[PDB]
Symmetry: D2
Subunit: 497 residues, 4 copies
C-alpha cells in the first residue's frame, strides 16, 4: 500500500529512496528513533517510512559535525565555494525527480516543486561568487604604526530547523550561505516532509563523499519537537536558524537567548496587498489570485489581507470571484493543475475553524468556505468580505487559503492598517503614484521586511535578503549581507611598530 512500492512512483528510487529510509546522516546513515510514515496529501496514501533520530543519534551527530568543522573551517572559503558549486550541479541533475517528490509529499504543484529546487540551485551559484568576497574592511587606525581590520569567522555549527511548506529552498538558502562561511550544518526538517529531507541529504552527501570530505559537514537528524528543542537548548549549536510558526519560534528564541546562543528567526506572516484607486486592475486581479491561492495559501508570503479603495472594491471582488472559479484543481503533479491540497488533515480543520470564526466576527464568505468533496485534503479557496480590519481572525495567521477583503479611503489609514498586525513579513501596494510609492518605502510606509510595488507579496529573489520584522522574528536569509548572520565579527588592532 506504500506508494513507493507502486510502479507509477518508481521514479522515487532515482532519489535513492526505499520503503524504509535512514533519517540520520553524519557521514554514516542511521536512525534509532521512532519510524515515521509520511503521506501524500492529494490522496492520504502512505508514501514511505523514515527512521528518525534518537537522543544518542543526535548526540553522536553533533559531536561528529563539530569534529568535521575542524577540517572544514581550515578550507579556504573559495574552495568551500567549489563544493557548493558541485552541490548546485548535483541538484540540477535531479531537479525533475526532486521537484516531483516535493509535489508528492508536500502537495504544491509541480512547477513550484521544481522551482523550489531551482531556488536552491540558484543560491548555490550565487554563493560560489560570494565565497571569494566575504569579509570586512581594513580601516584607517587613528594610531600611528597600527593596523585596524574587521575579520569574519565561522560561528561553528549552524542548526537549521525548517517548515513543511518550503521543504527544500529554506534549507538550501541556509546551507549554501552557512557552508561558504565555513560552518557545518545540522538539519531537522518538518516531520511531514522527511522523505524530501532525506532525498536532499543524499544528494549533498554524495558530493561531500566524492570530494573526500567528512559527511557531517551537512548532517541530518530527522525528528520533531524533541530534536528541535534539543537544538535550541544545545550550547554546541552556535547559530540556530528556525523557520516556522511564530508560536514555536518565540520559544526557540527564548531558549537560545537563555544560553547566549545566536538565533535567526523566520516566522509567521499576515501579508497585505493594497490596491489604490489608480491601480492597474488587469494587474491587481491576477496578482491577488496568485498571491492568495498559490501553494493553496501555504506560503509564508501568501496574501491574507486585501485592502481595496472604496471606489474599485466591488469590481475587484467580483473579478476575483470569477478568477477563483476558473482555478484548475487536481493532483499537484498533473498537467495544467494550478491548485492542490492542504498539507494535512489538521490544516483542513483549522481552515474550517477560521471560516466559522470569520462569520461570528461579522464577515461574509463570498466565495468558497467549504471542504471539496474529493479525496485528499482539498478545500475551496475562500474570500471573506465585511470584517473590520481589526477583527481578531484577520490579525491571526491561518495557514490556509482565506483572503480577508477590506475597503479603505486614504493612504495614511491603510498604511497604518498594513502595519497594525503583529506579523511583519511581506506587503505590497498597487498604484501608479510616484510619491505614494516612495512614501511606502520610507519611514512612514510599510513596516515589513519585504516591501513591494505592483508585484504581489510573494515577490522576492536570491539577490536580496529575505525575512521580516516584528513577530516574523528579524532574521534574514539569502542575499545582500545576510551572510554576516552566519559569522562572528572581530575588530582587530595590530600594533606592528
Amino acid at each position: 500500500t506504500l506508494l513507493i512500492n507502486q510502479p507509477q512512483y518508481a521514479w522515487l528510487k532515482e532519489l535513492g529512496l526505499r520503503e524504509e529510509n535512514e533519517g540520520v546522516y553524519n557521514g554514516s546513515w542511521g536512525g534509532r528513533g521512532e519510524v515515521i510514515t509520511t503521506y501524500c496529501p492529494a490522496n492520504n496514501e502512505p508514501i514511505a517510512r523514515v527512521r528518525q533520530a534518537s537522543v544518542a543519534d543526535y548526540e553522536e551527530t553533533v559531536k561528529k559535525a563539530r569534529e568535521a568543522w575542524k577540517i572544514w573551517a581550515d578550507i579556504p572559503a573559495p574552495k568551500r565555494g567549489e563544493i557548493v558549486r558541485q552541490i548546485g550541479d548535483a541538484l540540477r541533475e535531479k531537479i525533475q525527480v526532486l521537484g516531483s517528490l516535493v509535489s508528492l509529499e508536500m502537495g504544491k504543484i509541480l512547477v513550484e516543486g521544481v522551482g523550489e529546487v531551482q531556488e536552491y540551485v540558484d543560491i548555490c551559484d550565487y554563493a560560489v561568487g560570494l565565497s571569494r568576497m566575504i569579509g570586512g574592511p581594513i580601516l584607517p587606525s587613528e594610531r600611528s604604526g597600527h593596523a585596524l581590520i574587521e575579520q569574519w569567522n565561522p560561528v561553528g555549527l549552524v542548526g537549521i530547523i525548517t517548515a513543511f511548506n518550503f521543504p527544500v529552498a529554506v534549507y538550501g538558502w541556509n546551507n549554501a550561505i552557512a557552508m561558504i562561511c565555513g560552518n557545518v550544518c545540522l538539519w531537522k526538517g518538518a516531520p511531514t516532509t522527511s522523505l524530501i529531507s532525506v532525498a536532499v541529504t543524499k544528494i549533498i552527501a554524495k558530493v561531500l563523499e566524492d570530494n573526500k570530505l567528512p559527511g557531517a559537514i551537512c548532517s541530518l537528524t530527522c525528528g520533531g519537537a524533541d530534536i528541535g528543542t534539543a537544538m535550541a537548548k544545545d550550547e554546541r549549536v552556535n547559530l540556530l536558524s528556525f523557520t516556522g510558526s511564530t508560536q514555536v519560534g518565540k520559544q526557540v528564541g527564548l531558549m537560545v537567548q537563555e544560553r547566549f546562543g545566536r538565533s535567526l528567526l523566520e516566522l509567521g506572516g499576515n501579508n497585505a496587498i493594497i490596491a489604490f484607486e489608480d491601480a492597474d486592475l488587469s494587474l491587481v486581479v491576477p496578482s491577488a489570485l496568485f498571491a492568495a491561492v498559490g501553494t493553496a495559501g501555504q506560503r509564508c508570503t501568501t496574501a491574507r489581507r486585501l485592502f481595496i479603495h472604496e471606489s474599485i472594491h466591488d469590481e475587484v471582488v467580483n473579478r476575483l470571484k470569477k478568477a477563483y472559479a476558473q482555478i484548475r484543481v487536481g493532483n499537484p503533479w498533473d498537467p495544467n493543475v494550478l491548485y492542490g491540497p492542504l498539507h494535512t488533515k489538521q490544516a483542513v480543520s483549522m481552515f474550517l475553524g477560521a471560516v466559522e470564526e470569520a462569520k461570528k466576527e461579522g464577515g461574509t464568505v463570498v466565495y468558497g468556505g467549504k471542504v471539496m468533496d474529493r479525496p485528499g485534503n482539498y478545500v475551496e479557496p475562500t474570500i471573506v468580505t465585511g470584517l473590520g480590519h481589526d477583527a481578531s481572525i484577520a490579525h491571526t495567521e491561518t495557514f490556509a487559503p482565506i483572503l480577508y477583503v477590506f475597503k479603505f479611503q486614504n493612504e495614511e489609514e491603510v498604511f497604518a492598517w498594513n502595519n497594525e498586525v503583529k506579523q511583519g513579513l511581506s506587503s505590497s501596494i498597487f498604484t501608479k503614484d510616484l510619491g505614494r510609492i516612495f512614501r511606502w518605502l520610507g519611514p512612514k510606509g510599510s513596516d515589513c521586511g519585504i516591501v513591494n510595488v505592483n508585484i504581489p507579496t510573494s515577490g522576492a529573489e536570491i539577490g536580496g535578503a529575505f525575512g521580516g520584522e516584528k513577530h516574523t522574528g528579524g532574521g534574514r536569509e539569502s542575499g545582500s549581507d545576510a551572510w554576516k548572520q552566519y559569522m562572528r565579527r572581530s575588530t582587530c588592532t595590530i600594533n606592528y611598530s
Copy 2:
C-alpha cells in the same frame, strides 16, 4: 554637607546642576519618583540629589518621545547629522567641567573623564559624515522592468540603559548613531551616575531647543531596575541597547525576545592578555599594567587574565609587581593621579571576596590584595599567581583590579584557554611571529569581539564596531556597519513596467 554647596565645587553649576536636580527630561524637566543622592567615591561625601522617574513620568516620556519621532524621522538624515554636529560642539564647549564631573561622581582619573567626553565628541563628528552615507544597495533584479532596492529606516524609539563605568561614552555612541539613523532615544543611566546623566542631557536639550526640535528626541528617565525592567518589557521601545552585567543583561535579553523586540547587548568581560616567548617585554609590562589597573580595573575591557610563556613568566611577574608598587594613588581629579577608588563599598567587598576565594581555590597573592587605609573606596591593585586556568574565580568577572596570572607552553592550548570562559569581549597577544598573529585572527584563534596584537585588551577606536560574543551578548556599537542595528532593512521590488 553637599559638595555642590561648597565654594570649591562651584564649577558644578556650569553644568546646570543644583542641590536637587530633575531626573526626567522629555521637553520639560521633572521627576516624581524617589530622590537619590549620589556620592563621591574618593571621599564618600554626598554631591547632590536627583529626582528620579515614577511610572507616570516614564509613561509620559515614552509617549512624548513617540510623538517626537514622527517629526524627527521626517528630517533628512544629513540634517539630523547637522544636529549631531551641534551636539559635538556643545560637548566640546563643556569638556573640562564634564570630565571633572565624571571623575567626581564615577571616580576615574581626570584624563579618562575628559577622554570619555572626547569619545562622545569624536563619534558625533564621525556620525556627521555617516548621515550622508547610511543606506543599502540598489541591486540588479532578475525580472525585466523591475527595480530591486534595499532600504533602511529607523526602528523608532531606542531605549539606552548604561553602566556606571562609562557614564558618558556608551550613551554617546548609542545616541550619535541612533540619532542620525532617525531614531528617538530614551536614556536610563546607572543610578550612581545620575548627575552625569542629567549634565549630558542638559547639554543636548539646549541644542534641540535652539533648533526648535522636540526635546523628547533625547529623553531621560533616571531610575534603577524598575525603570529598566519597564523598558525591557515595553513594546513601545523598538530597540533596547543595554550595557551592563551579564546577569542583568540575560534577563533584559529574555524580556525583549518575549515581546519580539530588538536588543543590543553589551555585557561582561573576562579579558586575557597572552605573552609569548618572543614578546617585547618592554611593551608587555606597561601594556599589562594599563590594561589591568586602568580605571581601577573597572573597564569592561580590563585585563583580568594574563597568560605568560613559562620561559618568561617569573621575569614578567617580577617586573609587573615592581610597576604596581610605583602607581600614584589620590583623588581621581588631582594632578598626576593614576589610580582612584572603586565606585562603591560593595565593589570593595567583592574585591575582598574574590581575593579570598582565589586563595581557597589555591592561588597566591603576590602583590596587593588589601583595602587601602584612607577615605573613599580604595583597594590595592592585585596580582594572583598559582591558580589553575580553570579555577572558578578566574572564570568569573569580578569588577575590580585583580589580575590572574597563568603559565603556558604551546600556542594551541593557550588559545583554547583564552576561549574557555563564558565571556567573549576582548583579547590580546604579544608576539612578533607573523603566522601566530594571523592564526590568532583566524577561525582557530580568539573567539572574542576584539582581537588585538601587541596592544592590550583596552585597545579600541570609534571607526570599528565595538562589542563581544558569547556571554558578552553579541551587540555592536560605534563604527563599521554597527548603525544597521538601529534600523530596519526592507527588500523592495518595484514593478515599474
Copy 3:
C-alpha cells in the same frame, strides 16, 4: 583707484587682503611672476593685485610640497581628518566675508557666494567621518595560510586646477578628500579669481601653521596657462584634477597620459531639461528659470537645452518669457538682485556671437539676446526657439545664459536627443510616469553623470559623486567612492605560514 583702498571695501581686510598680495604659498608667501590686477565684473573696477608664480616659484613649491608629503602621509587618516575639521570651522568663521568676495570678484549673487563657501564647509564635515572609513576589503584567499588584502595609499601630490565659476567649492571638494586620503595639494585657480584663491589659502595656511604642520601640504601657485601646463607635464604631480573647458581639458588629459600620470577631468556641459506632457508646469517653469539663468548661465550644470512636449511647448515658453521679464538685475552684492554680470567682457562677446549664430541657423530670439547698456559685463538672459535639435550652435557649450528650446513627441527620440551631444554632465526629466522614470535611469536612458527627475540640472549634493561622461571627462568629485581617485590600490597576498 583700487576698490580695496576705498572705505566701503574695508571688509576685504578681514580676509587679510591688501592692495598687493602674494600669490604663492608653500609654507612661505611670495610670487616673482607677473602681477595681475583683478576686476569686479559688475563695474570693471580694479579690486586689488596678486603677485603670480614664476617658474622658479613653481619649482620650489613642488619640491616643498613633496617634502611635506613625507610628514603628512605618516599622519593617521583620522588625525588628517582632524585638520580638515579645523579647516571647516575656519571657513565657517569667514563665511560671510568670503562669500562677499566671491560676489565681488567672480560676480555671482551673494546667496550663491555664501552657499559656495558652505559647500566647502559641508565637504570638510563629511570628510572627517570618511577619514575613519577609507580603505578596502580583507578578502578570503583561495590559498591556505595566506591573507589577501586590498590596501589604499595616497598618490602623493594632487595638483588642482580650477575654473572661474566655482572659485571656492571645486577646490574645496578636491582639497578635503585629497587631504584625508594623505595627499598634499597644489592649487592653481583661475587668474580672474586670484583674490579668492589667496583668501582661501590664507584660511587654510593658518590652520596648518597653528597645528605646526608644513604649509606646503596645501600649496598655492597663482598663474595662467603656463603654470597649468607645467602641472600637466610634471611627473611629480601624481594626480591632476582639472576643472574647466573641454578644449583645455582634452590637452591636459593628453599631457597627463603621455607621462602615465593620473587625471581627474571635470569638463564642459550642454545640459538638457525635458518636460513631458504629464509634467507639473508649476514646477517646470521655476526649475527651468533657475537652471538656465542662475549664476547668469555660468554653471557647468546650467540648463542650455529645454525639450518640451509639443502639447505644452507654447504654454511653457510663454510662462518662461514672463518669468524672465521679472528677473531682478543689478549688483550681485545687492540683497534683492537675482541676476548679475557675466564674468568677463570676452564672455559678453561670446554670448553675442552665439545669439547671432542662432539667428543665422534659423532660430528666433523670443526673449533677450542683447548686451545691457550699463556698467559691467551684463547681458540679457536669452530664450531661442525654432532651431533643430542638432543645430551646430545648440551642440556647442556657450558659457552664457542662452536657452535653446525644442519640441518633441515621443520618449525614445527625446532621450536620444538628450544623448546626442558630445557633453555628458547633467540631465533632467519632468514627468510623473513611473516607468519613464526608471527607463530614464536605465541603460536606454540618460547617458550623463547626473540623471535627475523633477529637479533641474543643477541638482546635486555632496553625498553623491559629481561629474560627467563623454567630453565631460569622466572624473568624479565629492561623495560615494570618489575618494578612490585620490589613492592607489594595491592587492596584497601575505603568506604567513
Copy 4:
C-alpha cells in the same frame, strides 16, 4: 603534412573545431577577408594552421553588428546575463584539457599553465555569476525632503579587448566575463601569434550564445594586428578599450583613446622585484625566485626580473638558485611534467642574447645560463646575472626573457626605493619574517606597485582581487574587487517624488 594540424599526432586540435584554414572574424557570422596568417609552434618551429584575419570591411561590419546586439543584451537582466556566463564556464570546463594543450602548442607555456589559464577563465565565469546579482551602487540619504538619491551603474556599451600573446586565454576571460555581466558587448583582437587560441575560445563562446538564441556579436572576434588594434583605439564606437600589452604600444593606445574622450583600461609592462631580507626563510625564497623568474620561460607580465638580496645571504641564495636552475626538466611544453619550454618567437631569442650582451657591457656577470639551448625550437638557458648596479639601463628595461638581475642591499629604506625607482609598477614581493617591515611595505612608504606581496613571489594573484599596476603599467584593473566599475558608467540620480 607540413601543417601540424594535418599530422596524425595532433588530431586532437580538431576537437576544438580547428581546420587547416580557419575564419578569424566572428560577429554571429564567421568570416575573414583580410590577410591569412599561419601560426607556428615555438617548440619545433613548425606551422600549425592558418587564420583568415579581418579586413577593414570585416571590422566595420562587426562593430555595427555588435552595437545592434548591444540593444538586445543590455535589456537582459544582469542575473540572466550571469546565467549565460555560467554556461560559458561549463563549456570551457568541457574543453579544458584540449584548449590547455593548444595554449601549450601555439604559445609555448607548459601544460599545467595552459590548463591553468582555461581554469582561470572558468573561475572568473563562476565568480561573475554571483557578481551579476550584486553589481550596483548605494541608495543614499538625500539632504532634500521628499527626494531620493541613487547611484546607478549602466553598461558603457561596446568593450574592445586587445590582448597579449603571453596570456592568450585568461586576460580575455577576465574582461569578457566581467564586461558581459555588466551588460556590455565585447570585441576581441588577440595577439596574431595566438590566433588559433582566439578562434578556439570564440568557437566555444559562439556556440553558447547561439544555443541560447542570442546574437553572437555579443562576443565578437576580429583577428588582426596593429592595423585592427589602432582602428579600435580610434573608434568612437568602442566605449571602453581594454589593452594588455607592452608599455610602448599601450602609451599610444591610451593617447588615442584620450583624444576621443573614450575610456581605456591599460595593463602594460612590468619589471618586478623580489626582495629577500636577512631574516628570510631561504627554503622558501629559493623555490619562489626560481618559479617567479623561470616560470613561463620568463614571459609573464609578473615575472621576477630583479632579485634584491641582503648582503649577508646574497652568495648563498645565488648558489642555491644556480643549483635549482640546473635541475629543471626541459621538453615540449604540452607534455605533462615538463617544467621549461621555449620562448615564443625567434625574435625573442635574439632579444634575449642582446640583453645578455648588454648586461655584460654594463659590468654584469652571467653566473648561470646566457646561451641558446642546443635543441630544436626557441629554447634559451634561464639566466642569472650578478654585479650590475641597480640603476643599470638594461635592468630598468623589460626584456621578455628569463634573465634575472641580482643585486645586494643593506637597508630597508634603500631597497624599497630601488623597488620603486623603475618606471613599471606591476608586482613586487618581499621575503621577511619582520612584522613591522611587512606593514611598512604595505603602507605609504612601501611598494608603489599594484600587487604587493609577502613571502610569495611576484606572480602571486587570484581572481578575488583586482589585478593590475601603477606608473607605466597603466593603472587599469581586471578581475576582482570592484574592478567591474571600469566596465560601467556611474550616474548620480536625484528623484524629486514630492
